[PDB]
Amino acid sequence: KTHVQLSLPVLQVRDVLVRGFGDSVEEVLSEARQHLKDGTCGLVEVEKGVLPQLEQPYVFIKRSDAAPHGHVMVELVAELEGIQYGRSGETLGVLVPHVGEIPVAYRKVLLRK
């Protein structure tokens, strides 16, 4: 399938134990996609002071369309030193590995895979 329905656990930034997916734009996009497939991916909602608490490169989920079965269509965009790899709509949040942190909420998304 080109798209996969996922429910992403929303994590508080200060709970997150692994604050990024790796060390290159290509690696973080690769790792984020693997974790999304394996159900081991969390979402941190971006506010003032969140991103500097996470590791670059960042992986964002961004709205790709204006929401089948409640699931917002999203795609992945990475960022490193203020340059983004991809082009898409509004940020729903930043992806991080999920290693058992307790979520505050779930974000239903339809991921272009």
From Swiss-Prot:
Protein's cellular compartments: Host cytoplasm
Residue ranges, annotated region (Disordered): 1-113
Protein name, as recorded: Host translation inhibitor nsp1
Gene of this entry: rep
Job description of the protein: Inhibits host translation by associating with the open head conformation of the 40S subunit. The C-terminus binds to and obstructs ribosomal mRNA entry tunnel. Thereby inhibits antiviral response triggered by innate immunity or interferons. The nsp1-40S ribosome complex further induces an endonucleolytic cleavage near the 5'UTR of host mRNAs, targeting them for degradation. This inhibits the integrated stress response (ISR) in the infected cell by preventing EIF2S1/eIF2-alpha phosphorylation upstream of stress granule formation and depletes host G3BP1.
Interval of the full protein contained in this chain: 11 to 125 of 7096
Residue span, CoV Nsp1 globular domain: 2-113
